[PDB]
Design a protein around this ligand. Structure first.
Ligand SMILES: CCCCCCCC/C=C\CCCCCCCC(=O)O[C@H](COC(=O)CCCCCCCCCCCCCCC)COP(=O)(O)OC[C@@H](O)CO
Ligand SMILES: CCCCCCCC/C=C\CCCCCCCC(=O)O[C@H](COC(=O)CCCCCCCCCCCCCCC)COP(=O)(O)OC[C@@H](O)CO
Ligand SMILES: CCCCCCCC/C=C\CCCCCCCC(=O)O[C@H](COC(=O)CCCCCCCCCCCCCCC)COP(=O)(O)OC[C@@H](O)CO
Ligand SMILES: CCCCCCCC/C=C\CCCCCCCC(=O)O[C@H](COC(=O)CCCCCCCCCCCCCCC)COP(=O)(O)OC[C@@H](O)CO
Ligand SMILES: [Cd+2]
Ligand SMILES: [Cd+2]
Ligand SMILES: [Cd+2]
Ligand SMILES: [Cd+2]
Ligand SMILES: [Cd+2]
Ligand SMILES: [Cd+2]
Ligand SMILES: [Cd+2]
Ligand SMILES: [Cd+2]
Ligand SMILES: [Cd+2]
Ligand SMILES: [K+]
Ligand SMILES: [K+]
Ligand SMILES: [K+]
Ligand SMILES: [K+]
Ligand SMILES: [K+]
Lengths: 317, 168, 317, 317, 317
């Protein structure tokens, strides 16, 4: 690593000393001649005439190819080893606004199609997950997501959000409890499996808990007869065939700060069913009549994509 | 082996198998046996919601697509996932209700504007569905018939005020 | 990648500028001297005499070995990474008349001995299949053949034919349904396992369905007593011991267009049992007497290899 | 390996011979010119004028790039092969004061946080253990720890201590019996699992036998009612919350050699409960009143970390 | 591969043509100057003065580094790919007096300690066998030993002997039947497991059949009472504690050709119990009195290692 820098400095001290005291040349000439000889440039303006001096140069040339054969084998030992550790995980994340995904399933593959590629780091331990992650454009970190020593290789202290979706609810609770020991302020989004563990995923410290098997178990048992609410959930939340659930923010200015929901009358102007308003980490589903809008709010509503355009200009100034 | 389970002449068949390959292949086998039975499948990937309908499923439920889109939308804001979690999964305050219109009960022939449902009951009328077709956001030029189903979101104190409002 | 091109252009701007304004040499000389110095050629016709100029050249030489050490480590990071992704699958097919084989069994190994090597791409996911495919002379693409995102890495839109032979009939139906979503006109040849799924492999969109376990199950149960039809199937279709089933085309001209099968009388002239005629994606097994031949037909028949030579000249003009 | 040294010596004999007998130059000039030509230095003071001599140099130059293309491919065949064997185990330990760990579990991961990294070699055979060992900073040797031919690749004859912790007690007894066949004087620390095998691990030759499942099984069954001894074991031996079990040595001089334990009176001076004294591979738990201290003893005691400082100065001169 | 040879020949045609027709130099000078410029030697006796000629050389120099960057990336694509196929099996045996070992167990590990290392090729398919074979000094060929297409990668047609020891007796019979289809004259040594398959291993074509579980099953059931024949088998055949079973050949001359076994009287002279004589692929255990020795025979006997020395000089002339 740095023994190469000494040996390169050794042959400049062997060579310069040899040239100056045999040819009688200057110190600035003896430095200049050694640097065009080790580098195999060789202008030939200051060649050595004496047969002792001709035997000196041969020694310097073999030490020229000598140190260019120790520096090459140290570079190629560095590059084959670094591209092997980088390939099979085994590397430390250095980024600072990335998204870490603990575990890998279909629900995390579906959230890679709405995120960037090089921003996402998948921390898993299986060997088949490594080839699925590299095909999808994310980066693979090899580690146990429940072990706190391996949650720091993924750099979850300087991350934008962490997404936990593991094989059990035992590992999901234990991965949330380990992230909250490192960084108490990072955003954790977690997937529950059983209905009994939605409360234990929140007490462990998840900010958003999503339970897909409990939603899908209710829609299965309520579609045996008619299935009208399963058509609503599938066309608005899953496929977005004709409707879409949007959240739009109210900016500064915004032409409506202060009026009630009755005087604003967003539905009959626009055509968007207003569900609720997002006043700062709470959700008021069906706000009452005398709710007055503020700045920085977020309006959640269902509407056609040609009606959201009629809304996003209605609230902008 | 699907005839040992007697899928011919049943209320519904619910298919949820270990892969999407076996969920499609099970629906193609039920349609060999009974063409008219109700099949409720579960899609795992997004690309197979259309292949499960062409195979013959009457209702496809894709939970990994709903959960996948709510994960990539809750990195910043997370107000959409709060609504889904509290009316579809947990039903903590509000829940989705479907109530049918009985025969000769205060609503046969009235328009939606003077039905006045959101102001006398408090329930958010999401849509009305008649005959396996959901009319989300019914317009003011719409009338109620006996047999329609009102799909709404409301509190348990408000849902029972609706079910008395739709009675004779 | 392209930061190397800037840094190479940087030292030509550092060097040329240094040479011209110290030695007083021309602009075309200062460009020529820098290119024989970075490349370590060094003719020595335009060497720098001044001791400031001799200290300049040393700086240029270290920047010569500097950029030849960043360009080498970027090439070797490119080559070790590219030969590692190419080795374990993980690469995109770019060809346009290739044959894609989804899955791998003995029936697909038997159709590699009648095809080329570099024309065939095997799309599978197992790790033991990768070493069997590389031994046989085909190319391995790592992917799930049922996933439509991995059927496009194998480039099945610009393929000659696709051959589906997977572990279940569940995966074979689901791989056919995924190819027909990409390209509706490509040719799909599929292998059925159970008799109940021959009709579902055709409705999913396979052009040719082969059911080997249904042929082999009928020959087993009809050889307990005598086994005369199992000798016919084995010597004509499997081994080709003395007979062979051929299809010969009728070309343009062809000396027989228009005559009936009775007047042509192919059997007693040649010795080939005529099974049927291939008039354009249909097969008329045992055509009647007043069937008249056309051009572009295909004649299917069983005969000895010294009787097919007596046939292929009988229909050629 | 050494055929390269002959071929390099071949072209110096081809070249020198060619230069001397065509140009008529000296023997010391013909040696000097060949070494600045193969190395591509090329001063150009002794260039060859004759058109036969110009055709000679071209041959020497192609043999210059010839042997620099066999020496590079032999180096790169050496480096890719050596970094592949070193990566997956497959290498011989050459150190002489290292610590060998046979097997890998949580109890050996906990003794890596109190040891160095490059001093520790983990000898195992699993493929998942290799990635856990490389993450922790130790070195992985691939081998069966029960096989005596693979205990010598880990160099357990010149080791500081060996730590055996394997999957069974069958393998732990068989690994101890194999180390004692190689080096009878090395220190073996072994982990027992069942209570019946503590005596067979000592007769096989372990110097220290630790049985964690027998300690943990007694504390579980004696904590159903009150659990006061399980609080002592957890706060002194496991966590070191407020107390710690230390061993301090008595040096030469030491101001106390010769006095009894009653006259020294270590507890009421310091505050450390004296358990026992380590007189040379024996432990006298609760020594009697007329035990006289010597030099080179070791005092085992429990105390707060602000009381061990009051002890380590009390016994030092 | 050979497109590099064209491109190297391209720039000699670009360069020579450029030099001759601008500088007006000779054809033998223009060839000589291009070869000292592409190779970066650059004597500088024939430098180009004209500013058009100085712009020509720069183009030739970039094409010099151009083709030395396509030749390096083709060499390094060749070496990383060849050392990867050679590492994981995947290579063809080219030797002609080697020993092929189909399968791998303890009985084949015990016959590697009496054979050479580079003479032995182990043909197996498991991934853990590859690391055990590389540790022992043999070479690993990846293949199925029952498949005849993979028995030819191991080159069993030009082998000294083949040793079959597989996981079943089903695979051992099927590997012998496949070797005898390739080379009918090669020597096959096979290991049986059940007593019923010793006859099927000989009819399939093994030259020597060894059945270790049938020998060990008889010695177990005949050592319950006394165990005197199990001491004989263990000390002569397995350990060679004090006795050894040797075969010595009778050479030409040999001082004893023609005499009977009674007149030769080998036991009371030497001390070696004579078991039998090996007259040409047969074994006469306890030859009768009037058996006369010949040349080229082989004498099988049990004796101490200080009695075999008294025998090997008694039969030599
Ligand atoms: C003389 C002037 C040389 C200017 C020096 C060049 C270093 C540039 C850095 C690029 C290498 C990428 C970084 C490699 C690096 O620094 O890692 C070190 C070890 O590897 C190393 O020793 C890398 C070796 C550094 C010296 C190699 C220089 C010639 C290599 C190519 C031959 C020319 C063709 C630390 O662990
Ligand atoms: C100066 C004139 C140089 C003429 C330039 C040479 C490029 C030839 C292309 C052959 C390389 C194969 C293609 C490599 C390539 O282009 O990939 C790029 C990155 O890799 C790269 O930067 C490849 C590095 C290109 C520059 C390396 C030139 C000297 C390398 C060998 C030293 C001589 C011995 C893009 O991602
Ligand atoms: C001429 C004067 C040359 C002075 C000779 C250089 C050897 C330095 C040793 C460093 C190499 C690391 C040790 C490599 C080694 O010795 O292993 C041998 C085989 O590999 C070998 O043949 C290694 C090849 C030794 C000769 C390679 C010299 C030029 C390589 C780089 C080209 C310059 C850029 C034995 O198995
Ligand atoms: C100009 C005169 C050159 C004399 C030519 C050198 C070839 C020596 C053979 C040693 C290489 C080992 C054998 C490599 C080989 O021939 O395989 C071919 C492909 O690889 C190849 O193209 C190998 C490339 C052959 C040309 C590379 C020469 C310079 C490489 C190193 C740069 C110097 C440092 C066939 O598939
Ligand atoms: Cd999950
Ligand atoms: Cd959504
Ligand atoms: Cd499913
Ligand atoms: Cd099959
Ligand atoms: Cd055929
Ligand atoms: Cd243990
Ligand atoms: Cd302790
Ligand atoms: Cd065996
Ligand atoms: Cd023996
Ligand atoms: K030069
Ligand atoms: K020169
Ligand atoms: K050079
Ligand atoms: K040069
Ligand atoms: K290189």
């Amino acid at each position: 690593a740095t023994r190469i820098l000494l040996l390169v400095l050794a042959v400049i001290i062997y060579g310069t000393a040899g040239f100056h005291f045999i040819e009688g040349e200057s110190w600035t000439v003896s430095l200049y001649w050694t640097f065009v000889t080790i580098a195999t440039v060789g202008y030939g303006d200051y060649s050595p005439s004496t047969p002792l001096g001709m035997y000196f140069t041969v020694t310097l040339i073999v030490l020229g190819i000598g140190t260019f054969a120790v520096a090459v084998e140290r570079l190629l030992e560095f590059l084959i080893n670094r591209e092997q550790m980088k390939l099979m995980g085994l590397i430390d994340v250095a980024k600072s606004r990335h998204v870490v995904i603990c575990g890998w399933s279909e629900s995390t593959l579906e959230c890679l199609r709405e995120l960037r590629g090089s921003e996402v780091f998948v921390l898993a331990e299986d060997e088949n997950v490594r080839k699925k992650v590299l095909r999808s454009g994310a980066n693979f970190v090899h580690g146990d997501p429940t072990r706190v020593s391996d949650l720091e290789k993924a750099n979850v202290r300087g991350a934008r959000a962490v997404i936990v979706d593991l094989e059990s609810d035992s590992e999901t609770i234990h991965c949330i409890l380990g992230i909250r020991k490192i960084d108490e302020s990072v955003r954790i989004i977690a997937e529950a499996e059983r209905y009994e563990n939605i409360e234990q995923l929140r007490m462990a410290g998840a900010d958003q808990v999503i339970s897909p098997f409990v939603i899908s178990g209710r829609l299965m048992s309520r579609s045996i007869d008619d299935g009208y609410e399963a058509m609503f959930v599938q066309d608005v939340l899953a496929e977005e065939s004709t409707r879409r659930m949007v959240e739009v923010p109210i900016p500064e200015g915004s032409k409506l700060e202060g009026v009630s929901v009755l005087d604003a009358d967003i539905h009959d102007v626009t055509g968007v069913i207003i569900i609720g308003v997002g006043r700062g980490d709470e959700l008021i589903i069906d706000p009452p009549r005398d709710y007055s809008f503020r700045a920085g709010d977020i309006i959640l509503g269902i509407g056609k994509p040609e009606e959201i355009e009629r809304l996003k200009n209605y609230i902008s100034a």
